Design a protein around this ligand. Structure first.
Ligand code: CHL
Ligand code: CLA
Ligand code: CLA
Ligand code: CLA
Ligand code: CLA
Ligand code: CLA
Ligand code: CLA
Ligand code: CLA
Ligand SMILES: CC(/C=C/C=C(C)/C=C/[C@@]12O[C@]1(C)C[C@@H](O)CC2(C)C)=C\C=C\C=C(C)\C=C\C=C(C)\C=C\[C@@]12O[C@]1(C)C[C@@H](O)CC2(C)C
Ligand SMILES: CC1=C(/C=C/C(C)=C/C=C/C(C)=C\C=C\C=C(C)\C=C\C=C(C)\C=C\C2=C(C)CCCC2(C)C)C(C)(C)CCC1
Ligand code: SF4
Ligand code: SF4
Lengths: 69, 206, 154, 208, 80, 43
């Protein structure tokens, strides 16, 4: 839909992707690609970097889950 | 208010409505609220036991030093062999009875209505254990006189209680250390201080 | 007298160790005048050795056939000065270190860039926390009961 | 606390630092290292100077007056250096503890007065008593200021406070001078003065 | 020789191939990302296995991925 | 200075200060209380 499909910009989100560095770790959604053809729109910004000194990564909608806080 | 040292604001997690607060929590122990409740009940019980202790030591030593009764020194008081009973029995009896007391106090602290509702038979007395408050049980068994029938609006009485009890606890620590490095009674140390105060203190112990 | 070990207050080889070390330090003492700094220091080390051996005797240490104090860790009440009382003395300090460090890391956790507070140690914050580990055996117990010691996965 | 951009400074021709505006009572711009570059560091060092000054003035008096009214105005004082070896009606570690317990009270009130500017003005026993001191380091109360001289115009107060710390600075210098003298020289300070006034040349720090 | 694979997590930043010193990779159009391009690996025969491609893949773990496999004279990087 | 104290609070400077103080503590303890193998107080 033209309205947002994914989490809100700023919604602290958890990663269900098993192969990511931040698995079972919280994040901070900075953007969601509203194009309904990309596979991993959810641009997250974490607090601590990965082994490649990167704090951001694209994730899917099913590979993400917002916390109750 | 006056919180235990001027120039410092009291912690925001304790202020005012509590028995003798004065805002002394520099080490963040009452930061969590349920921890503070548990510690309040702990403090009250500690202070009351310590008050009974200071009375039972000062009175016995007033009788001893002056020479009214030949009671033993507080230090060497546990090994008195009683004729009718033995200490080996007394420890077990204390365990039983004070268990029935303290576990009841506990199960009231976690559930205030307990010990009075249903199947809480204590010789049919399931009404004197109403509790009315944490740390202040009330009732005909525990306050027969009932000086503070109310307990929320009894801040003067609870404040007197907790202040006298903090002081009694400090005096009990005094009894513990003062009579482990001097090996006498408190009254002996006092009259040793009141003869030559500038020559008999802690640091005059070489 | 346990574990086949004689006490050091009634051991022969322990006194022999004493005599041998004293003769060793006295052999190095007949090379200087008895009032100069080397001889005074050697005599001080000699008294240090003698008091050391006598203190190991009077504490009830157990000296084996080799004549050296063998510490008992099993939990014998006579030998809690060997392991259990200094063990508690250790664990109290070690948990102090851990608890002030943990409460510090939790204190800086709500910072914009917390890592700079691990490099540039916020001495006021730590110093306000540095004595908060005095009460670690009770604060940690409550944080375990309240659920604040161990983190939750989410 | 009025600034004086053209005050006389410690080192004429130099530009005094920005954090010394001239406001303080006796700030001649002497801070080369920058030990008071911060505002709160300056506020702390001010009271440190004040109390070092006052303790050093009491010290200089209790050194020289017992050493002046002993060599000429004949009295009997043991010394200022070896007075800690002398004996009194109390054990040496005991009265140290007593004066610690008694001085730490006042110094804790001072700590409170520095951290919180007005917190300790009420007498905790008799709250009708008071110290009418707005300025940190200058408690205008009865026990400290009974004669009413610590009040009035801020200019007169500033000249009086710089008079105070002016006496106190050379009091500090004099006390550590007596220290280094009684160490380097054997005899006492006023005896050192008389030996200097006998022969100013062959009586100085130099002996070789 | 080596088996280079590009997974669908690629953002199309063109670092994998601008780092690759042996022309193994090449960007192609795609519809799975905002950049509308993805890397492909046709010339895997020229792949030495240096993993400069996946030392420059800015994703959760990786999108480009090099699998060490049958080593030939050109994957072993031999001038002899 | 604020930045000088910021540097004194850095991990190596504060570490060597802390361990110099600590080492002096343990040193003076092992000089005042040398040769210690057993805790004899309430033994
Ligand atoms: C609280 C409480 C405190 C502070 C003490 C303190 C003491 N008890 Mg003790 N007791 C306490 C509860 C109890 N005691 C005893 C029965 C005894 C005995 C039988 C003995 C002590 C002894 C001691 C001493 C151990 C050192 C010390 C004075 C010992 C002692 O008096 O040595 C000087 C000793 O023989 N207590 C019972 C039952 C208690 C309940
Ligand atoms: C062990 C007995 C004991 C216990 C459990 C408490 C418990 C409490 N006190 Mg009290 N207190 C006591 C003895 C005790 N007190 C004594 C003897 C004094 C006089 C010195 C005081 C003076 C005092 C003041 C002035 C204030 C408190 C306050 C409090 C509460 C908050 C602080 C906190 O969480 O500390 C919990 C404490 C412990 C778990 C005990 C730790 C004991 C350590 C490990 C031993 C240190 C002993 C050593 C000699 C020092 C809490 C209900 C505050 C209050 O009432 O407001 C809510 C407050 O401002 N306390
Ligand atoms: C709290 C507390 C505790 C645990 C004790 C414990 C003791 N008291 Mg003390 N006592 C206390 C408070 C306490 N007292 C107070 C508040 C008063 C007042 C007294 C007045 C008192 C007297 C007058 C005597 C004891 C005696 C005793 C001992 C025997 C008590 C018994 O049941 O027999 C025992 C060591 C007796 C004792 O020392 O043994 C002969 C004894 O004669 N107590
Ligand atoms: C309010 C409690 C209280 C009271 C009234 C006293 C009173 C006294 N104590 Mg005790 N004492 C106490 C607590 C108390 N102490 C505590 C908590 C400890 C453990 C550190 C001691 C340890 C102790 C020793 C080891 C000795 C005394 C001695 C003395 C006497 C001389 C004063 C002295 O040495 O200063 C000691 C004062 C302190 C350690 C300060 C404690 C906190 C103060 C009292 C709180 C302020 C109110 C005096 C009768 C001496 C004695 O036997 O006299 C002949 C002695 O040898 N006390
Ligand atoms: C007790 C020491 C002490 C302290 C803390 C201060 C503090 C202060 N002074 Mg004062 N001052 C003192 C002694 C002291 N003074 C003495 C003795 C003199 C005369 C020599 C002066 C002369 C003076 C002038 C002329 C001025 C100040 C000013 C100031 C302020 C800014 C400078 C600063 O940050 O100082 C902080 C100082 C320290 C932290 C002390 C330094 C410590 C190091 C370790 C010294 C080591 C070297 C030293 C030379 C060895 C001493 C040997 C001795 C026997 C000679 C501050 C309030 C200025 C101001 O604003 O006035 C209000 C100003 O204009 N002071
Ligand atoms: C819990 C026990 C406890 C402890 C350890 C202290 C400790 C202290 N108090 Mg506090 N105080 C307490 C309880 C306590 N107080 C209570 C219950 C009251 C009554 C509300 C006060 C009222 C009080 C006042 C009014 C003052 C102190 C002051 C002081 C300091 C005395 C200076 C010193 O170290 O002398 C050794 C010291 C930090 C003094 C201080 O330094 O002020 C900041 C001061 O003026 N206290
Ligand atoms: C109030 C400050 C003051 C005063 C009046 C004196 C006075 C004296 N000192 Mg002492 N002294 C002082 C501070 C002071 N000193 C300090 C801070 C130190 C430590 C560095 C010393 C260390 C010292 C030693 C080791 C010895 C003396 C000696 C002497 C005497 C002979 C002078 C001499 O040998 O030159 C040496 C003088 C100095 C090292 C002082 C340095 C300069 C000070 C800071 C000047 C004081 C400020 C001044 C009042 C204002 C400026 C004056 C002028 C520019 C207008 C004389 C009585 C000697 C003695 O006892 O012989 C009898 C001696 O052996 N002094
Ligand atoms: C991990 C293995 C290990 C162990 C267990 C020991 C154990 C010991 N060594 Mg060995 N040592 C080791 C490794 C080890 N060492 C290594 C690797 C080296 C080479 C670097 C040495 C080199 C060495 C030498 C050269 C010497 C020792 C000595 C000692 C003894 C130290 C006793 C002492 O002074 O403490 C006393 C306690 C302290 C210093 C700690 C004080 C802590 C403070 C006061 C805080 C506690 C108070 C606090 C406020 C709480 C109180 C309670 C209340 C307030 C709550 C002890 C038997 C000395 C000795 O006597 O040998 C027998 C000695 O001479 N060791
Ligand atoms: C407090 C004090 C003395 C107190 C003395 C007392 C109580 C004496 C008591 C007694 O005598 C009696 C009564 C009787 C005796 O029987 C016993 C004792 C007990 C002995 C001295 C301070 C003495 C303090 C002194 C000398 C301080 C000197 C500081 C200087 C020179 C600072 C310089 C700088 O800091 C600035 C100003 C600016 C920076 O930017 C640059 C630099 C250069 C770093
Ligand atoms: C008696 C003894 C013995 C034995 C013993 C034993 C056997 C024990 C065991 C024990 C055990 C089996 C234990 C366990 C534990 C577990 C756990 C799980 C824990 C946890 C903990 C925690 C978690 C903590 C934390 C902390 C602290 C508190 C400190 C610092 C900080 C921190 C945070 C780190 C012997 C004879 C040898 C000797 C003598 C002594
Ligand atoms: S480096 Fe990775 S993310 Fe970037 S273009 Fe190549 S395959 Fe895609
Ligand atoms: S391993 Fe080396 S040669 Fe192979 S694709 Fe990656 S960068 Fe190119």
């Amino acid at each position: 839909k033209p309205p947002p499909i994914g989490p809100k910009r700023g919604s602290k989100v958890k990663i269900l992707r098993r192969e990511s560095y931040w698995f079972k770790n919280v994040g901070s959604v900075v953007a969601v690609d509203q194009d309904p053809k990309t596979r991993y729109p959810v641009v997250v910004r974490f607090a601590k970097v990965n082994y490649a000194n990167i704090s951001t990564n694209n994730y899917a909608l099913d590979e993400v889950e917002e916390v109750a806080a | 208010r006056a919180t235990w040292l001027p120039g410092l604001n009291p912690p925001p997690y304790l202020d005012g409505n509590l028995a003798g607060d004065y805002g002394f929590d520099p080490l963040g122990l009452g930061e969590d609220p349920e921890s503070l409740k548990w510690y309040v009940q702990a403090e009250l019980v500690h202070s009351r036991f310590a008050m009974l202790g200071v009375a039972g030591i000062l009175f016995t030593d007033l009788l001893r030093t002056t020479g009214i009764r030949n009671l033993p020194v507080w230090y060497e008081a546990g090994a008195v062999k009683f004729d009718f009973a033995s200490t080996k029995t007394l420890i077990v009896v204390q365990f039983l009875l004070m268990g029935f007391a303290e576990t009841k106090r506990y199960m009231d602290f976690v559930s205030p209505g307990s010990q009075a509702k249903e199947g809480s038979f204590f010789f049919g007395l399931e009404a004197a254990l109403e509790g009315l408050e944490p740390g202040y049980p009330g009732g005909p068994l525990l306050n027969p006189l009932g000086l503070a029938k109310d307990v929320q609006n009894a801040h003067d009485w609870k404040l007197k209680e907790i202040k006298n009890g903090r002081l009694a606890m400090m005096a009990m620590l005094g009894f513990f250390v003062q009579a482990s490095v001097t090996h006498t009674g408190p009254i002996d140390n006092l009259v040793e201080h009141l003869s030559n105060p500038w020559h008999k203190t802690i640091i005059q112990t070489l | 007298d346990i574990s086949g070990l004689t006490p050091c207050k009634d051991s022969k080889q322990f006194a022999k160790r004493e005599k041998q070390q004293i003769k060793k330090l006295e052999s190095s003492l007949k090379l200087y005048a008895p009032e100069s700094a080397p001889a005074l220091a050697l005599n001080a080390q000699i008294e240090k050795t003698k008091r050391r051996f006598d203190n190991y005797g009077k504490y009830g240490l157990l000296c084996g056939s080799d004549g050296l104090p063998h510490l008992i860790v099993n939990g014998d009440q006579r030998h809690w000065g060997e392991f259990i009382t200094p063990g508690i003395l250790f664990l109290y300090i070690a948990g102090w270190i851990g608890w002030v460090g943990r409460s510090y890391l939790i204190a800086i956790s709500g910072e914009k860039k917390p890592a700079m507070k691990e490099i540039i140690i916020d001495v006021p914050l730590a110093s306000r926390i540095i004595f908060r580990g005095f009460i670690w055996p009770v604060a940690a117990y409550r944080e375990f009961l309240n659920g604040d010691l161990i983190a939750k996965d989410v | 606390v009025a600034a004086d951009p053209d005050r006389p400074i410690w080192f004429p021709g130099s530009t005094p630092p920005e954090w010394l505006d001239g406001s303080l009572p006796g700030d001649f711009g002497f801070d080369p290292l920058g030990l008071s570059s911060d505002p709160d560091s300056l506020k702390w060092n001010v009271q440190a100077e004040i109390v070092h000054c006052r303790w050093a003035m009491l010290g200089a008096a209790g050194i020289f007056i017992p050493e002046f009214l002993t060599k000429i105005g004949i009295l009997n004082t043991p010394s200022w250096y070896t007075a800690g070896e002398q004996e009194y009606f109390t054990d040496k570690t005991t009265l140290f503890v007593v004066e610690l317990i008694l001085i730490g009270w006042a110094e804790g009130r001072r700590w409170a007065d520095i951290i919180k500017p007005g917190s300790v003005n009420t007498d905790p026993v008799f709250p009708n008593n008071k110290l009418t001191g707005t300025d940190v380091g200058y408690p205008g109360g009865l026990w400290f200021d009974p004669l009413g001289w610590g009040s009035g115009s801020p200019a007169k107060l500033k000249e009086l406070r710089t008079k105070e710390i002016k006496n106190g600075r050379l009091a500090m210098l004099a006390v550590m001078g007596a220290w280094f003298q009684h160490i380097y020289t054997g005899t006492g300070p006023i005896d050192n003065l008389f030996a200097h006034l006998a022969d100013p040349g062959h009586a100085t720090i130099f002996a070789a | 020789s080596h088996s280079v694979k590009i997974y669908d997590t690629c953002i199309g930043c063109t670092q994998c191939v601008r780092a690759c010193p042996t022309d193994v990779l090449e960007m192609i159009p795609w519809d799975g990302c905002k950049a509308k391009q993805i890397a492909s690996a046709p010339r895997t025969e020229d792949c030495v296995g240096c993993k400069r491609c996946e030392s420059a893949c800015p994703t959760d773990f990786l999108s480009v991925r090099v699998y060490l496999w049958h080593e030939t004279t050109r994957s072993m990087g031999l001038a002899y | 200075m604020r930045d000088l104290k910021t540097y004194l609070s850095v991990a190596p400077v504060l570490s060597t200060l802390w361990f110099g103080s600590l080492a002096g503590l343990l040193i003076e303890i092992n000089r005042l209380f040398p040769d210690a193998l057993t805790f004899p107080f309430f033994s």
